[PDB]
Design a protein around this ligand. Structure first.
Ligand SMILES: Cc1nc(N)c2c(-c3ccc(NC(=O)[C@H](O)c4cccc(C(F)(F)F)c4)cc3C)cn(C)c2n1
Length: 256
């Protein structure tokens, strides 16, 4: 038995904690560094065949807000001590993610209104695209939103499933039946972009409050239009929240 991953790539480090795993690996033939994700597949035939049906439909996706796909492949290695792993090879993004970007700019000066909305609009446009193809991200949060080396915003890892601060409440109690879950996540992200934080304590407290529609008074005054958008997006009743498309069309972006 030969391992495809081990022959063709020389591993660099880990990028993603798994509960699967995400490595940085140089491809030997093309000398480029990729984000490789090793999933352990289920034992069940009909669980596996549902994952595979997914990679099939995600492979087809092309959008500027979706990380660039390269390859997907299976390995069934011998028992170290019937396990089959799925590898996906993705464009390696900039190591500074949206959390890191935000953590480095803790003054309203550094959070240039126009830059923030631009960043957000990309995240929103990506989510529209996914929804238009009857797909939901279900994993939007600043730690899983990236920039390319070309400095383009990408919605991060999603799909292929076997911190809860950005999940909608219905996502946290029952299965996340609705695709509106993504609209909720967007609500928080838009706010957090426009309103920097000094401490971790302050951030947890303030977001936890905004979830319950208890907005800082300086925010409500400083950004009146955004405040109504973020109120809509955070509607406790999913059916009340706007569609992805409705947010893009909002006049706040019109001329930028
Ligand atoms: C520096 C860096 N760059 C990355 N791209 C990632 C990623 C990062 C981003 C996106 C994704 N996957 C996807 O977007 C989707 O799963 C997907 C899209 C399109 C096709 C496919 C297909 F392969 F067909 F299944 C999957 C995965 C990782 C592993 C995670 N981390 C921690 C990263 N760090």
């Amino acid at each position: 038995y030969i391992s495809r991953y081990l022959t063709d790539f020389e591993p660099i480090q880990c990028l993603g904690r798994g509960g699967g795993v995400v490595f940085e690996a140089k491809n030997k033939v093309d000398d480029c560094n990729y984000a490789i994700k090793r999933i352990r597949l289920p034992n069940r035939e009909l669980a596996r065949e549902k994952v595979m049906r997914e990679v099939k439909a995600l492979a087809k996706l092309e959008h500027p807000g979706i990380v660039r796909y390269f390859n997907a492949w299976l390995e069934a290695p011998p028992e170290k001590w019937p396990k089959v792993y799925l590898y996906i090879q993705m464009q390696l993004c900039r190591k500074e993610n949206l959390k890191d970007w935000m953590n480095g700019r803790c003054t309203i000066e550094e959070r240039e209104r126009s830059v923030c909305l631009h960043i957000f609009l990309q995240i929103a446009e990506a989510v529209e695209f996914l929804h238009s193809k009857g797909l939901m991200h279900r994993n939007l949060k600043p730690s899983n939103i990236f920039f390319t080396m070309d400095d383009v915003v990408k919605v991060g890892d999603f799909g292929l499933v076997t911190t809860k601060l950005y999940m909608s409440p219905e996502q946290i109690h029952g299965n996340s039946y609705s695709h509106k879950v993504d609209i909720f996540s967007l609500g928080l992200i838009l706010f957090e972009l426009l309103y920097p934080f000094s401490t971790q304590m302050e951030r947890v407290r303030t977001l936890t409050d905004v979830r319950n529609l208890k907005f800082p008074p300086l925010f409500t005054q400083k950004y009146p239009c955004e405040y109504v958008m973020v109120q809509d997006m955070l509607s406790p009743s999913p059916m009340e929240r706007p569609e992805a498309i409705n947010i893009i069309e909002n006049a706040v972006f019109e001329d930028l």
